[PDB]
Ligand binder design. Structure first.
Ligand SMILES: Nc1ncnc2c1ncn2CCN[C@H](CP(=O)(O)O)C(=O)O
Ligand SMILES: [Mn+2]
Lengths: 555, 411
DNA sequence: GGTCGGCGCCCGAACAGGGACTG
DNA sequence: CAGTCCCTGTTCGGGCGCCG
């Protein structure tokens, strides 16, 4: 076997584990023909070699159909080899996005043929890549081969290729510095601001520099005319858009078809704005089976019909202009949902997206808005390497009042206000000093860990009082219930004194939504009030009316 | 042509496996240049995906410094080689450094590139440079000399360092010199003028051996923030209630705190704003508790084996309090920072500045770096913290969310 | 078909750490 | 007191999409 012009990568098994010795699958006769046709051809080019009984290893093998071609693809079930192979550190830190591309005078795209089959494998490793090809007869001993290159199906093959590819492109990139080469696996986006005459010169220079190392650039896959097809997009000299997206239209929906739908909805959310998957993902919660049929809810059928109408009209993105600033703007779509658009010129979207993660039981729009900005800021630095300027539906004074008082550290980058309802605002403000002329409520709750019963009430400075029996409760539920009562039976200004740390904390974080029903009722009574002041005291210390009520709700 | 000091990981431990976080444009260009230069000077060399170990990398600018400085987050590596730089080749801590009138810090990380690293240990120094929009896969490197930011670097270089400092420590025996990571802490009681002169004497004393910085400290001017009680002339029910809760929360630190007489003033179910006169027995319980808060805690003392832990409280209006302890309620040092950079406009910049100011005091006083309990969400911190870092070291931290109890540290 | 790797989303289950009350 | 459980937040395992 001849020597490959590319450097090899040393690979070891994990210390203390031998190669795989697993039985071969039974194969259909249509795939056995497709395999031996590819097995014998790759043996001629020096890509696989026969082995005798000196190779005690074995691994399964199969084949699937390639997309839009009569040729078959060969894959290896290395599930037992990959377990005992050494760990690798991948180099593909993310997927490139067309919004980060800069306007280039000349563009060229090409894809090399049989990428993994043009890069060699380490020598000392090929013994563990043993497999059997079952003949058409179950009695024929079968032809045992072993791989010589990167097997499609091995966990180290993609990592080895991308590193070997970058090492071969460095001498071309070092001699051609102003040639932007987006390198993703085998596909090469090549752009330059040189004149279209000198462009094709560097094209063949690279097509000959790649050929020197065993990399063929077929003229079948060569692309010199726009629109280019790159990473599942269409690249025009001024605009770009995703390749068409096809959604299933099943009459009887299963759980798998929702995930196939939800997954494609998230992929479309990068340029198609306003996509919502709140109610469609509400179908997947607590579901037991993957093929279980699920009837579409009324709120889910509406969400699907809206997304279908959005996919009807054509949308397109633009490219990144490093001269003008980056802009991102968010909107409050639904309760727990957000959508944003990034652009440089108005209505010329670079990309869109959505944030809808619910963190914690108790939250407010200002908490969620901050969480969305961070999701956008990280996303932008990935693609453009900078932080965009933000247009937020929150008043400047509304944000100022929040972060100055909040006990956590929180901050938002350079932003400006935009008057697009619904505006994020704090629905209520706890006073900082007690209110003169307001009734003072000393509340406490208590419950029994076994009986799940308890009381919750209050005493006031005006002689008012109440205690309520409670069922199926905990000590924490009572202490909140004691506050809910004080808010119900008070005027428009009320001072409340509790000895529950758990209750005071949740309320001071000014939540406007919650998973617990009792919290939502407490929030509702707080918005009706004009002035509310809370305070904390240590229980069982004989304090004001706190002891009197600690003994009233004691049982 | 220098022999390599052989090092090994702590037994039963694999190398660090931390992903590289996304970086801005100005940082990636600052790394590509420095790595191209360091590769040309043989300090680093490119590697491949066969190395399963990796470590984050990013760049900074020190205070009032234009040049970019490469920095590596070797925290996960230093946790996995801790037996080397504490048992075999440990650096003593001068107890008199904290008592000096002025101390200056010097970036001496340039000298570590003169010593080669152990070959079997270069596998665990791998890092990856990201590209904007993932134009190219990860450009990887590994260190061929002593890396900046490691813990084993000042331990291997300690023998060569002492011989460089002896001609200066002999001429100036009254000057304290401490080496922590890529920084050299020099403390003297000289006047501020001739202090800066001896610094340049050492800057040239180090340049002739193959090495520049300058940051001034004043450890004698470091104060502690005691627990204070409000001195009012008229108290309401709410004032006394807040006072008791504060005095009760402090009673865990000072065991001699009592609230018996004050709780008797809160006998009736009185309105909060109602003014309550202070009884004769209560006015004395208030005065006695004020003096106990002046006294230092009984039984508090630093333990070299225990880890340092520090908490930070955001007090609003640019105010920040902090405490350093090893055991609960046994605080080694309290304090308060005010009017830092980013005051009244950026919390994260202030919190980053506070972590640096606190960590610096930890190196001067104990020679250790504390693990931080930070009042910020994990996602809010891991996004913005690198944008305001100005130090060559990085402490460990964790994220908390304790709502305000009763203001125990700030009035 | 039931291969690898990367990144993204959504879910539930498992993990974990602090606060009140109890033998 | 150590032993809980009440509550809340995090981490990870497992589906689909997308790319090659
Ligand atoms: N489903 C798949 N499983 C494994 N590896 C795959 C794959 N889709 C693409 N690749 C790598 C590139 N493959 C082509 C030729 P083929 O598609 O015949 O493998 C090339 O190497 O350029
Ligand atoms: Mn290809």
């Amino acid at each position: 076997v001849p020597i490959s012009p590319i450097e090899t990568v040393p690979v070891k098994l994990k210390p203390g584990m031998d190669g795989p010795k697993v039985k071969q699958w039974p194969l259909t006769e249509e795939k056995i023909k497709a395999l031996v046709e590819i097995c014998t051809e790759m043996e001629k080019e020096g890509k696989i070699s026969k082995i005798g009984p000196e190779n005690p290893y074995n691994t399964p093998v199969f084949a699937i159909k390639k997309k839009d071609s009569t040729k078959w693809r060969k894959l290896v079930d290395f599930r037992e080899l990959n377990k005992r192979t050494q760990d690798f550190w991948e180099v593909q830190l993310g997927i490139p996005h067309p919004a980060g591309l800069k306007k280039k005078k000349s563009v060229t795209v090409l894809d090399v043929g049989d990428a993994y089959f043009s890069v060699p494998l380490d020598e000392d490793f090929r013994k563990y890549t043993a497999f059997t090809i079952p003949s058409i007869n179950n009695e024929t001993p079968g032809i045992r081969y072993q791989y010589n290159v990167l097997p499609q199906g091995w966990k180290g093959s993609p990592a080895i290729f991308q590193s070997s590819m970058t090492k071969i492109l460095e001498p071309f990139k070092k001699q051609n510095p102003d040639i932007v080469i987006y390198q993703y696996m085998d596909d090469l986006y090549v752009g330059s601001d040189l004149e279209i005459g000198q462009h094709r010169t560097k094209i063949e220079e690279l097509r000959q520099h790649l050929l020197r190392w065993g990399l063929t650039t077929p003229d079948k896959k060569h692309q010199k005319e726009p629109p280019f097809l790159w990473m599942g997009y269409e690249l025009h000299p001024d605009k770009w858009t995703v390749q068409p997206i096809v959604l299933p239209e099943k009459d009887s929906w299963t759980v798998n078809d929702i995930c196939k739908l939800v997954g494609k909805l998230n992929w479309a959310s990068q340029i198609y704005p306003g996509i919502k998957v709140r109610q469609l993902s509400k179908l997947l919660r607590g579901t037991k089976a993957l093929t279980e049929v699920i009837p579409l809810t009324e709120e889910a059928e509406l969400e699907l019909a809206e997304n279908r109408e959005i996919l009807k009209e054509p949308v397109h993105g633009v490219y990144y202009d490093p001269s003008k600033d980056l802009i991102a703007e968010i909107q409050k779509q639904g309760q727990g949902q957000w959508t944003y658009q990034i652009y440089q010129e108005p209505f010329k979207n670079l990309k869109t997206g959505k944030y809808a993660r619910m963190r914690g039981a108790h939250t407010n729009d200002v908490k969620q808005l901050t969480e969305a900005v961070q999701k956008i800021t990280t996303e932008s630095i990935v693609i453009w390497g900078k932080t965009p300027k933000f247009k937020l539906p929150i008043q400047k004074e509304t944000w100022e009042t929040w972060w100055t008082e909040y006990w956590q550290a929180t901050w938002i980058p350079e932003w400006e206000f935009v008057n697009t309802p619904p505006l994020v605002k704090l629905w209520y403000q706890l006073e900082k000093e007690p209110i003169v002329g307001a009734e003072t409520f000393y509340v406490d709750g208590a419950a029994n860990r076994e009986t799940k019963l308890g009381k919750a009430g209050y005493v006031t400075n005006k002689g008012r009082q109440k205690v309520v029996p409670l069922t199926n409760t905990t000590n924490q539920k009572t202490e909140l219930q004691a506050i809910y009562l004080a808010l119900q039976d008070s005027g428009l200004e009320v001072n409340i004194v509790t000895n529950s740390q758990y209750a005071l904390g949740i309320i001071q974080a000014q939540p406007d939504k919650s998973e617990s029903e009792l919290v939502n009722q407490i929030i509702e009574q707080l918005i009706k009030k004009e002035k509310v002041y809370l305070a904390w005291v240590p229980a069982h210390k004989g304090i004001g009316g706190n002891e009197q009520v600690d003994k009233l709700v004691s049982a | 042509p220098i022999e390599t000091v052989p090092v090994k990981l702590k037994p039963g431990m694999d190398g660090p496996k931390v992903k590289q976080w996304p970086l801005t444009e100005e940082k990636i260009k600052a790394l590509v240049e420095i790595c191209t230069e360091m590769e040309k000077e043989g300090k680093i060399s490119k590697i491949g995906p066969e190395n399963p170990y990796n470590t984050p990398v990013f760049a900074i600018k020190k205070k009032d410094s234009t040049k970019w400085r490469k920095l590596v987050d070797f925290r996960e590596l230093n946790k996995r080689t801790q037996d080397f730089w504490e048992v075999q080749l440990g650096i003593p801590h001068p107890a008199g450094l904290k008592k000096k009138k002025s101390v200056t810090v010097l970036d001496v990380g340039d000298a570590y590139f003169s010593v080669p690293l152990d070959e079997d240990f270069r596998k665990y120094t791998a890092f990856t440079i990201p590209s904007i929009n993932n134009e190219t896969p990860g450009i990887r490197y590994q260190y061929n000399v002593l890396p900046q930011g490691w813990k084993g670097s000042p331990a291997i270089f300690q023998s060569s360092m002492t011989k460089i400092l002896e001609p200066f420590k002999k001429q100036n025996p009254d000057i304290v010199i401490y080496q922590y990571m890529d920084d050299l802490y020099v403390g003297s009681d000289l006047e501020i003028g001739q202090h800066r002169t001896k610094i340049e004497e050492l800057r040239q004393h180090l340049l002739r051996w193959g090495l520049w910085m300058g940051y001034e400290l004043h450890p004698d001017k470091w104060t502690v923030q005691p627990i204070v009680l409000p001195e009012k002339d008229s108290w309401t029910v709410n004032d006394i209630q807040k006072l008791v809760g504060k005095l009760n929360w402090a009673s865990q630190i000072y065991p001699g705190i009592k609230v018996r007489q004050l709780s008797k003033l809160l006998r009736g179910t009185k309105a909060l704003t109602e003014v309550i006169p202070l009884t004769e027995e209560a006015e004395l319980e208030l005065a006695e508790n004020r003096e106990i808060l002046k006294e230092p805690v009984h039984g508090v003392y630093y333990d070299p084996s225990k880890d340092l832990i520090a908490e930070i409280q955001k007090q609003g209006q640019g105010q920040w309090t902090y405490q350093i302890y090893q055991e609960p309620f046994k605080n080694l040092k309290t304090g308060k920072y005010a009017r830092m950079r980013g005051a009244h406009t950026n919390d994260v910049k202030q919190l980053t500045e506070a972590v640096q100011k606190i960590t610096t005091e930890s190196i001067v006083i104990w020679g250790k770096t504390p693990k931080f309990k930070l009042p910020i969400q994990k996602e809010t911190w891991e996004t913005w913290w690198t944008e305001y870092w100005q130090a060559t070291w990085i402490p460990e931290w964790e994220f908390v969310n304790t709502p305000p109890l009763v203001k125990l540290w700030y009035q």
